[PDB]
């Protein structure tokens, strides 16, 4: 678990403030006068479930304390 969160913490998505700052810098550059695809951890239940059944996820972390536990009971079986 400690080694898994060292890899997953290097692909943390940008926060609202950082994304806004990055977009405003580009906007200010344009207002005066070719990038690679980003990388981040995928989240959201529906998004990850859609990724799993399309065979795109390389590794899926499932929380063990979802209060309506039926939200994630099918997930280990779907992943296997």
């Amino acid at each position: 678990a400690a080694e898994t969160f060292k890899l997953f913490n290097k692909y943390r998505p940008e926060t609202a403030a950082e994304k806004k700052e990055r977009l405003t810098k580009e906007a200010a550059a344009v207002a005066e006068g070719a990038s690679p695809k980003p990388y981040a951890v995928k989240y959201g239940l529906n998004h990850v479930v859609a990724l799993i059944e399309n065979k795109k996820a390389k590794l899926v972390l499932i929380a063990n304390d979802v209060d309506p536990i039926e939200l994630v009971v099918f997930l280990p079986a779907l992943c296997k």
Partner: protein, 50 residues
Amino acid sequence: MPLTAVPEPKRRFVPSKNEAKRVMKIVRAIREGRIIPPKKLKEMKEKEKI
């Protein structure tokens, strides 16, 4: 092999379009003086706090 044969959308291969529209909106706001650019803001915080 996957469950469905839905084709891959073209928006997954090219840069973001929502961000392009948002950047152009910020550009339009900057040109109207509603948003002070970060360089000008950095200039204004080195001139008063004395």
